[PDB]
């Protein structure tokens, strides 16, 4: 796949590398300094994707690959985006994409239970609804340019600067429990099982952070009470149209589950509904 270095390529020279964002078995992040990535003479934080020491020729295509697929991707407000790369030789091969400095969603939900009230420093209704209307934002986006996330989740929902949150990937988690019904039986992964996911989300951001299915087996028999209609209840801080459109996106059939573009419209109007 074609890559484009003059759009693209951005010179190590201008990148200091900081504190360690994250690792994992195959990449690592790492938070630096880019002086000017966006043609303007600023120093700004970014994100740095690279390879670990002794990583091998598929872990550097691995990389690489994820590469072209966010240049092919390409521009979303509500997605980490790729901001430039070091490929040429001379040095390790750096995806930059944009910093998200409060990190991911959950995380930074279940620390605001304290800063929290639904009317008027404190989230509020308009907040979880902001959050949930840019992640449908962002997914309408990623569905355009026919993606599938296939992990949907908040800790995978980067929090920004303006509250701007950001869909990455485009204490731990049982990934299970935010997989639609069809794709945990007949292991179908499509943008309507997203949707289910994304009911899921919706109901993390309403718990203010919480892990769905509370205490729940995740047995073959959940798999089939989830088939058959059992469903998660209201998280304690959820609006009752917040709730039905969590119902709407668990919906038995993927064709009956709205779809992305039909849900930013929806939390469109409960936005504006909002005030």
Known sequence: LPYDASKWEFPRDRLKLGKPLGRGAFGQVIEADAFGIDKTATCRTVAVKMLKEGATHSEHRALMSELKILIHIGHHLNVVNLLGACTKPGGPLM???????????????????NEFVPYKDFLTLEHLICYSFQVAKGMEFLASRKCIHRDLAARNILLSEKNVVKICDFDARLPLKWMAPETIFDRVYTIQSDVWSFGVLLWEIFSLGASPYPGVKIDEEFCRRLKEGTRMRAPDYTTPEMYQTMLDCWHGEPSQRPTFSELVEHLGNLLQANA
């Open 95 to 113: 995806v930059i994409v944009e910093f998200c400095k409060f990190g991911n969603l959950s995380t930074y939900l279940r620390s605001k239970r």
